[PDB]
Design a protein around this nucleic acid. Sequence first.
DNA 1: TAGGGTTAGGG
Length: 183
Amino acid sequence: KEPEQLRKLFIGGLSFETTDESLRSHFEQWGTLTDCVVMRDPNTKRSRGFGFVTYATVEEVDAAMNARPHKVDGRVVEPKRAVSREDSQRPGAHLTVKKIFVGGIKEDTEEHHLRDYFEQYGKIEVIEIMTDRGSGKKRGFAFVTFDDHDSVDKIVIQKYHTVNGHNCEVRKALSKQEMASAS
DNA sequence: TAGGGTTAGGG
């Protein structure tokens, strides 16, 4: 079977009136849910405005994501691949971004190498293999931009990515200022 | 719009 983490979706922006039952009624349209829950304030019992839905298979998760936009209880919500508690500790881990930072790529890496691995996740809009300003030397990293934030999410929730024959690290791209705030 | 009494012992 597939790991519970990859079979789960974070549902943000829920109407304060959405309950486990109404959330389930909506999302069961795309598959068998093994878990469905609205997070609430431990004390006031009030809804925190987000919940989680888990399907029996990742294929059903993909169907749900392909069904966006989603409107639950009259409110447009935002379904996202669930980022593990461990990974949610990283700065910007929950940001909606369309660009990924690809690190540790060999110096002879070319755009076709990046496409052969990344296109499977979604439409690529931009690819930029970074080089040094002045020497023209390859720097060992690149940026890839997609047309859907879910393409980036589907990627970053995975541990390994093979480009030009070897593994490379992939993370959501952070702005110059985001980088500065994180360190 | 980031998790539900869900994260370092004791040899």
